[PDB]
């Protein structure tokens, strides 16, 4: 179990750690977060009391270094930092913990939620979508745009998601115009899976990461990317059976975890109705269709 300590908490802020969150008051004696499970990526995120605008936060993996958060009063945000030195990192943490003003990552033992939401997410792939190579962790916020959004303006602060566009020469073989547009199996399996992602695990990892950025930061281009990656699978007549089985599980836990009150902005009616009721895979997402119908029947 790993620890992300805090130098201080000088401004009132709601702090998120994965799917959990807690309020910290201005200059409250808050020390950080302990007992973070090893083996998964994590995200620690922030919404200031005085400006609910700009949710922001950091993707990290404690196996890749020692990390702590301290507030920067010039840039006005909680910044993640690394201690390459270990003894001093353990040494600074040592005084802070007998005086236990440190919240415990509050995982229930039965609960596989985080694992189910991050099963295929890897830090190495996150760091290719979020380019800032001098750090081992990745900053995301509400307003970052995606490469594809910028094609339709600062590239260093972009989300370099894989570009999917159903009306593109990449998606459509000359001479198979109708065939490839109505059945995207070529684009999914040859172009994207064999060509760009290499395997379905990498594909699912980007899909899961896009969802999490949409949910935790309300990042709109991430939501577009999540729906695009779902629609490309649902609009393919030929999909490996193991990918469909796993997709249904992935989406089920995403829909389960989505705040009930955020469904109106985070879910695209057209895609979900198409995917569950019209697409080739309309009969292959049993768990996802069941939870969608019982939880958001209005959307459908």
């Amino acid at each position: 179990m790993n620890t992300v300590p805090f130098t201080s908490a000088p401004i009132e802020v709601t702090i998120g750690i994965d799917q959990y969150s807690f309020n910290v008051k201005e200059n409250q004696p808050f020390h950080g977060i302990k007992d973070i499970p090893i083996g998964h990526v994590h995200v620690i995120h922030f919404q200031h009391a005085d400006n609910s605008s700009m949710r922001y936060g950091y993707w990290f993996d404690c196996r890749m270094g020692n990390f702590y958060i301290q507030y920067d009063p010039k840039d006005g945000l909680y910044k993640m930092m690394e201690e390459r030195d270990g003894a001093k990192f353990e040494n600074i943490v040592h005084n802070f913990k007998e005086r236990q003003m440190m919240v415990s990552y509050p995982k229930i033992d039965e609960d596989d939620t985080w694992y189910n939401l991050t099963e295929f997410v890897q830090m190495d792939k996150i760091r290719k979508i979020v380019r800032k190579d001098e750090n081992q962790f990745s900053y995301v916020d509400s307003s970052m745009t995606t490469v594809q959004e910028n094609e339709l303006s600062d590239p260093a602060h972009s989300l370099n998601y894989t570009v999917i566009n159903f009306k593109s020469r990449e998606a459509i073989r000359p001479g198979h115009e109708m065939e490839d547009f109505l059945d995207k199996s070529y684009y999914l399996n040859t172009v994207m899976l064999q060509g760009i992602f290499k395997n379905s695990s990498n594909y699912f990892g980007e899909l899961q990461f896009a969802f999490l950025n949409a949910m935790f930061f309300g990042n709109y281009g991430s939501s577009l990317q999540w729906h695009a990656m779902i629609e490309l699978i649902c609009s393919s007549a030929t999909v490996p059976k193991h990918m469909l089985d796993k997709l249904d599980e992935i989406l089920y836990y995403q829909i389960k975890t989505l705040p009930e009150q955020y469904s109106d902005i985070l879910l695209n009616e057209r895609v979900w109705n198409i995917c569950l009721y019209s697409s080739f895979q309309k009969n292959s997402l049993h768990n996802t269709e069941k939870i969608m119908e019982n939880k958001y029947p209005e959307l459908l």
Partner: protein
């Protein structure tokens, strides 16, 4: 974006554009089978591709052999239209290719966009106008060449005959759409109006009769009366 009453004069400016109409591509007769079920028999069709400024009509004849062994023909017909329009553009010299293609039915937008991906600079547009191009098969010489075709074939016409020698392309299009609207509302009356006087003939190289300026005013008036009438007969007014 879309073409409507507000940007109507754009059709007659000097940017090459084409209207595409797919109504008559997939044409069937419905009939009973010996067992008393229903079946369709396809008949020859055509793509109606028209330059509204020049009157040049690119009439691509769709022979019924192109449906043999195919499924979901109404959906295929839209993609077949888009394939043939794309093939037409590629056949034209660069300086004759259109800068816009306006489709008369929105269901043509995606098929044509996908087929024209190689032409990112050609804008594909819908329209809100309710244009009467489905009545093109009421033009006797156009119907005749479609029905006689034994194979796929492109035939070139000027739908304005020689009108542009005397009138503008705005007026020529207004005349055309009035004639076609009349032919669509009441084909027989419309056709009687156009031919009642046997001293006015259709030149071998024309589609419509050789009316003087004055006779066109009379004719145009008769077509409006017809359209207003049928609008009464239909709604009782």
């Amino acid at each position: 974006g879309a073409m409507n009453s507000s940007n109507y004069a754009e059709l007659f400016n000097n940017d090459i554009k084409l209207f595409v109409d797919d109504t008559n591509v997939y044409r069937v007769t419905v009939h009973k089978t010996f067992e008393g079920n229903v079946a369709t028999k396809a008949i020859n069709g055509c793509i109606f591709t028209l330059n509204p400024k020049t009157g040049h009509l690119f009439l691509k004849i769709i022979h019924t052999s192109v449906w043999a062994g195919q499924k979901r023909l109404s959906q295929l017909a839209k993609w077949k239209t888009a394939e043939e329009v794309s093939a037409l553009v590629r056949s034209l010299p660069k300086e004759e290719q259109p800068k816009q293609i306006i489709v008369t039915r929105k269901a043509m937008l995606d098929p044509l966009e996908v087929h024209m991906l190689d032409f990112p600079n050609i804008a594909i547009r819908p329209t809100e106008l309710r244009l009467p191009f489905s009545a093109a098969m009421s033009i006797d010489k156009l119907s005749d060449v479609v029905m006689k075709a034994t194979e796929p074939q492109m035939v070139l016409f000027n739908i304005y005959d020689d009108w542009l020698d005397r009138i503008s392309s705005y007026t020529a299009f207004s005349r055309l759409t009035l004639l076609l609207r009349a032919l669509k509302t009441n084909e027989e009356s419309a056709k009687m109006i156009l031919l009642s006087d046997p001293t006015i003939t259709i030149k071998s190289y024309h589609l419509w009769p050789s009316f003087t300026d004055e006779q066109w005013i009379t004719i145009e008036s008769q077509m409006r009366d017809l359209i207003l009438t049928e609008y009464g007969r239909k709604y009782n007014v």
